């Protein structure tokens, strides 16, 4: 059972504060190492400069080669294989560009075809790959 007496509300506080760290979610949300180890500095999007193009392998039931870009963030200085999203559009991304990047779906995981990619290209010099793919605005 519990400590159900009338004056035990310190004991329940001290116990409930002690068990909440074993959740995965509260420990990443409220320990400092999640804020100061990751890229993006605790933001949502980030502009970054292309170091090079990198084409990574794939996992086994979906055999392919995925086409990605290594990125030097202006903010952080870190290195990131951001997935080039669309169907062509390896072409529309080049060397030394403004490359807005963001995550795929959840910051603690990846999408299940790639060895390590977590990140995804948006802008090419303030021109989105939605624009570049169709609507043909400008490079």
């Amino acid at each position: 059972g519990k400590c159900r007496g009338l004056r035990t509300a310190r004991k329940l506080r001290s116990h409930r504060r002690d068990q909440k760290w074993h959740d995965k979610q509260y420990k990443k949300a409220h320990l400092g190492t999640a804020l100061k180890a990751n890229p993006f500095g605790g933001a949502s999007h980030a502009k970054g400069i292309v170091l090079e193009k990198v084409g990574v392998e794939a996992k086994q039931p979906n055999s392919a080669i995925r086409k990605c870009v290594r990125v030097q963030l202006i903010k952080n200085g870190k290195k990131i294989t951001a997935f080039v999203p669309n169907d062509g559009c390896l072409n529309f991304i080049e060397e030394n560009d403004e490359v807005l990047v963001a995550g795929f779906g959840r910051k603690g995981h990846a999408v299940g075809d790639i060895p390590g990619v977590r990140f995804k290209v948006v802008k090419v010099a303030n021109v989105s790959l939605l624009a570049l793919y169709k609507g043909k605005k400008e490079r």
């Binding site: 084409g55 392998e57 086409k67 169907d87 062509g88």
Partner: protein
């Protein structure tokens, strides 16, 4: 390691088709007017087990 070569093999080998003219569509009140008039007030001369809005 491997190539970044085939950047859109299929999108390069696309036989394009021009998007042909179709008359412009009602919206708002009037689209949902014919959405209702398509399938609720009028199907009842048949029964209700077959499901064919696109088949």
């Amino acid at each position: 390691h491997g190539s970044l070569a085939r950047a859109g093999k299929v999108r390069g080998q696309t036989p394009k088709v021009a998007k042909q003219e179709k008359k412009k569509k009602k919206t708002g009140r009037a689209k949902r007017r014919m959405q209702y008039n398509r399938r609720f007030v009028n199907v009842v001369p048949t029964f209700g087990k077959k499901k064919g809005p696109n088949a």
